[PDB]
Amino acid sequence: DIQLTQSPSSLSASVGDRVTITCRASQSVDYDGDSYMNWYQQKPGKAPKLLIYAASYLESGVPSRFSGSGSGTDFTLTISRLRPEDFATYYCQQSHEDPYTFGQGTKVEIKRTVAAPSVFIFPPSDEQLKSGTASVVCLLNNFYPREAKVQWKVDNALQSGNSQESVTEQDSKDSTYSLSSTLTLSKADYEKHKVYACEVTHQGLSSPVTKSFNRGE
Amino acid sequence: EVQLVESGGGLVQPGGSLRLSCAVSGYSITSGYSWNWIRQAPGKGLEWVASITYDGSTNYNPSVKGRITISRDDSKNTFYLQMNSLRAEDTAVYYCARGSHYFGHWHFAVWGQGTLVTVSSASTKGPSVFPLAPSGGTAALGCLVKDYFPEPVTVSWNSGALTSGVHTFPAVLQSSGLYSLSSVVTVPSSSLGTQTYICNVNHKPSNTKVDKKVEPK
């Protein structure tokens, strides 16, 4: 098989930057004067979209900021001026011979100024408590960069082992992230305590921000 | 546009068989194109697995060769993938893709939306849907979609009329082996008394469709 190696594997670039990613094939993908390398863009949760065919030709309707060049083993994809919606994984793919093969992808992230999160905390709903479990949810909304710490506290005691986090893919318009953290306890244990807090640490914050509520208002 | 619509995805038991279909917009003529299946394991890159052309030539990626069949029913503008002896590595989003010619070679100009195949012996379970009730000028609210299997769940807001400020988080796999996800939206806190906020939750594997009104307090 023809192995394709993309470089870098990931990159962060500001809006407006010129971005060049490379694809190296383990053998020539030339055939009779043409180079059979394609590029696709894949945004999160979406199917890949063809950008470039035969190394350098833009599929019709693809924005002109995308271009491709190369020959033989070595290929590049350039974004001449990055827009925030260009956050995606970019794949090269050789059409020279079966089996068609893809590179491992280059994940392009957008760099931007640091923004502290806005934090919200949600008590467990009465409907859920009736079913016997308590989920307490902490939302960190629209921050940059992705790195953040959530620490749950129950009657001031620091929790561990009873929470899970998930983070959104970078927003296609403002390039921020959001994070939700869920603390899960049984109804019985939930009603044994009063103060529920999440404490958020982030580069944009000079001291941690705590949101809390007292069970039963 | 032309549309490629995959179906047949879902839960398959290990060692069982997979039968996916790709239905092409009926106005479309399929003779000048190649018809492909390409899959993507969660978090991984793209793997081409099979193609068929107008004269019936099939090609298969040796990575799966021996347990894979691509077939066609032009009278329904439909192409099929069968795979047998499924194993864990076969859990993936399977895409249908249509190849267009470049000097006797193919590039994937049109893609279906992909359908998820989960190789597992576990049982389908529909979620519970709980409100994340609103409690400066912006307030957050949401819906917690708890304890479902398998992926995926989709969430929209007010039947799709509410899109800005929406964050639907990646699901987390809980220690029970069941998934949970939250979807949130930030809205003007002025509109908390006038506006209706309904999250439309769809878990197709369990035929769960819930439209949950999230009111304040």
Residue numbers in the entry:
A (entry chain L): 1 to 217
B (entry chain H): 1 to 135, 141 to 222
Please give me the paper's original passages concerning this structure.
As most of this interface involves interactions between the CDRs and the VL domain, and mutating the CDRs could adversely affect the interaction with IgE-Fc, we mutated Ser81 and Gln83 from the VL domain EF loop, which contribute to this interface, to Arg81 and Arg83, respectively, thus incorporating bulkier, charged side chains. We created two omalizumab-derived Fabs, namely FabXol2, with Ser81Arg and Gln83Arg mutations, and FabXol3, which additionally contains a Leu158Pro mutation. Complexes between IgE-Fc and both of the omalizumab-derived Fabs that contained the Ser81Arg and Gln83Arg mutations were eventually crystallized. To understand the effects of the Ser81Arg and Gln83Arg (VL) mutations on Fab crystal packing interactions, we solved the structures of FabXol2 and FabXol3 alone. Both FabXol2 and FabXol3 crystallized in the same crystal form, with one Fab molecule in the asymmetric unit. With the exception of the light-chain residue 158, which is leucine in FabXol2 and proline in FabXol3, the structures are otherwise essentially identical. The packing interactions that involve VL domain residues 81 and 83 in the FabXol and FabXol1 structures are substantially different in the FabXol2 and FabXol3 structures. In FabXol3, Arg81 contacts Pro158 (Cκ), while Leu158 is partially disordered in FabXol2. Engineering the Ser81Arg and Gln83Arg mutations in the VL domain of the omalizumab Fab clearly disrupted the interactions seen in the FabXol structure, but these residues also formed new packing interactions in the FabXol2 and FabXol3 structures that were seen when these molecules were crystallized alone.
Immunoglobulin E (IgE) plays a central role in the allergic response, in which cross-linking of allergen by Fc∊RI-bound IgE triggers mast cell and basophil degranulation and the release of inflammatory mediators. Instead, the Fab alone selectively crystallized in different crystal forms, but their structures revealed intermolecular Fab/Fab interactions that were clearly strong enough to disrupt the Fab/IgE-Fc complexes. Mutations were therefore designed to disrupt two recurring packing interactions observed in the omalizumab Fab crystal structures without interfering with the ability of the omalizumab Fab to recognize IgE-Fc; this led to the successful crystallization and subsequent structure determination of the Fab/IgE-Fc complex.
